[PDB]
From a paper:
A new serotype of BoNT with unique substrate specificity was recently identified from the genome sequence of C. botulinum strain 111, and designated BoNT/X17. Remarkably, BoNT/X is the first and only BoNT member that can cleave additional VAMP family proteins, VAMP4, VAMP5 and Ykt6. LC is a zinc-dependent endopeptidase, while HC is composed of two functional domains that are responsible for translocation (HN) and receptor binding (HC). Despite only ~30% identity at the amino acid levels with other BoNTs, the overall structures of LC/X present a fold similar to other BoNTs with largely conserved secondary structural elements.
In the first form, data from a single crystal were collected up to 1.35 Å resolution and the structure of LC/X was solved using molecular replacement with LC/B as a template. Residues 1–413 were clearly defined, however no electron density was observed for the N-terminal tag and the C-terminal end (414–439), all in solvent-accessible areas. The active site of LC/X has the overall conserved geometry shared with other BoNTs. The Zn2+ ion is coordinated by the triad His227, Glu228 and His 231 and a fourth coordination provided by a water molecule linked to Glu266. The water molecule provides the nucleophile base required for the proteolytic activity. Interestingly, access to the catalytic pocket of LC/X appeared more restricted than in LC/B, and /F. The catalytic pocket of LC/X shows a narrow entrance flanked on one side by loop 57–60, composed of polar residues (Thr-Asn-Asn-Thr), and on the other side by the short 261–263 β-strand. Deeper within the cleft, residues 160–165 form a β-strand that borders the catalytic channel, with the S sub-pocket delineated by residues 235–242. On the other end, the S’ sub-pocket delimited by loops 192–195 and 360–365 is well conserved, and may help stabilise the interaction with the C-terminal end of the substrate upon binding. In addition to loop 195–217, a major difference was observed for one of the loops involved in SNAP-25 binding by LC/A known as loop-2507, which in LC/X makes a three-stranded β-sheet arrangement from residues 243 to 263 and extends away from the catalytic channel, in a structural feature unique to LC/X. Loop-250 was shown to take on a different conformation in LC/A where it went from an open configuration in its free form to a closed configuration upon substrate binding.
Numbering used by the authors: 1 to 413
């Protein structure tokens, strides 16, 4: 069946199929006592949009201006953002539009299909793969749980910094042991952080001889979301590399941060020039770790399954195996191929190239640039097929991302 995106208006009635009131996945944490439930919309099978601010972790629980020293000088705060029905509908439409954009190229469509289908490896109960809260969200009505519906990804609005974007895996052992975990994403389609890149096709003073200089650009929020979707994919496969750092001075992996280092999960997820000279030692170790984790799960869990149900079908589609019920083995060659796709081929920089989107050269930015607001729902500014770089308007070849474009609106900070 061809992937379609379900459209919604925020005021669409609850149906228990695609429109629910969702209990927070992190409801058991003390900081989330009494929160929700929140209206949620199933945009793609197992992918839900919740038009609420993300405030469900320690670092996102307070939406006010931080009481500590600020981590990012390009952050912008507004505790009231996304508290009205009209802002919630705008957000919902924006996320849907960005997803339609992503689906409009085969690489983006395949990414969405992968997230939809790649359920975490369930626990086994009475010989059957059986769902947990690591693979579902609860539809809560009047302090009763009506149903538990499958979910691999829940997309929310931003946390405290309304121009920040992030991914959170639900359970921290499954995120890295090969099982996989439901992910939450905090996403901001309308508030964007600019970046610098060298460029030559812009209005320039006649007295400047050499026109190719660093210029300011806005990112395409589809690229921003795809970046998070790559983290989500790692999280669903249980292959997150959050607890390793790559040291650019030595070219080695380290367990703790160093002066000129980057978290390895971000190095891979962003891609680009910085991932082109990773050592064979590093790549071999990463592959071996994942292979070992999967071999262990196939032995200790998958081979305890005695009941063939739909969850087993979905898991066999996710995890390349050979053999029969009770005696599966990892399909080494197919697993390696799939792993190397998800780790080394799937990344923001490669995806952006396929979408004709400009991204920055390095994951880490050299300087903060004040965030902007842009109404991406206006097709004159941002289209599903071309983003900001609209050919019929003369904005192809990255020109539509130039920050001087009128649709990138200054924020009073
Ligand atoms: Zn990232």
């Amino acid at each position: 069946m061809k992937l379609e995106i379900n459209k919604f208006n925020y005021n669409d009635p609850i149906d228990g199929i695609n429109v629910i009131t969702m209990r927070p996945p992190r409801h058991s944490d003390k900081i989330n006592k009494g929160k929700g439930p929140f209206k949620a919309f199933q945009v793609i099978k197992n992918i839900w949009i919740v038009p609420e601010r993300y405030n469900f972790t320690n670092n996102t629980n307070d939406l006010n201006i931080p009481s500590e020293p600020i981590m990012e000088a390009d952050a912008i705060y507004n505790p009231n953002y996304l508290n009205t029905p009209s802002e919630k509908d705008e957000f919902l439409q924006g996320v849907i539009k960005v997803l339609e954009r992503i689906k409009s190229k085969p690489e983006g469509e395949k990414l969405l299909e992968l997230i939809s289908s790649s359920i975490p490896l369930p626990l086994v109960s009475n010989g059957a793969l059986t769902l947990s809260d690591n693979e579902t969200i609860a539809y809560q009505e009047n302090n009763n749980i009506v149903s538990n519906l499958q979910a691999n990804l829940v997309i929310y609005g931003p946390g405290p910094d309304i121009a920040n974007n992030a991914t959170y895996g639900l359970y921290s052992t499954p995120i890295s042991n090969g099982e996989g975990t439901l992910s939450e994403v905090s996403f901001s389609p309308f508030y964007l952080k600019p970046f610098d890149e060298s460029y030559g096709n812009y209005r320039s003073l006649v007295n400047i001889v050499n026109k190719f200089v660093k210029r300011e650009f806005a990112p395409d929020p589809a690229s921003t979301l795809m970046h998070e979707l790559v983290h989500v994919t790692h999280n669903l496969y249980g292959i997150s590399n959050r607890n390793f750092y790559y040291n650019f001075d030595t070219g080695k992996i380290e367990t703790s941060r160093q002066q000129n280092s980057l978290i390895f999960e971000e190095l891979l997820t962003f891609g680009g020039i910085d991932s082109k000279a990773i050592s064979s030692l590093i790549i071999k170790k990463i592959i071996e770790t994942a292979k070992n984790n999967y071999t262990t799960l196939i032995s200790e869990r998958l081979n305890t399954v005695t009941v063939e149900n739909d969850l087993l079908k979905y898991i066999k589609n996710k995890i390349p195996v050979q053999g029969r019920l009770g005696n599966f083995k990892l399909d080494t060659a197919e697993f390696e191929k799939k792993l190397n796709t998800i780790l080394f081929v799937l990344n923001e920089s490669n995806l952006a190239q396929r979408f004709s989107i400009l991204v920055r050269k390095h994951y880490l930015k050299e300087r903060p640039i004040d965030p902007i607001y842009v109404n991406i729902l206006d097709d004159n500014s941002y289209s599903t097929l071309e983003g900001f770089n609209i050919s019929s308007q003369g904005s192809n070849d990255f020109q539509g991302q130039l920050l001087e474009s009128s649709y990138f609106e200054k924020i009073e900070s």
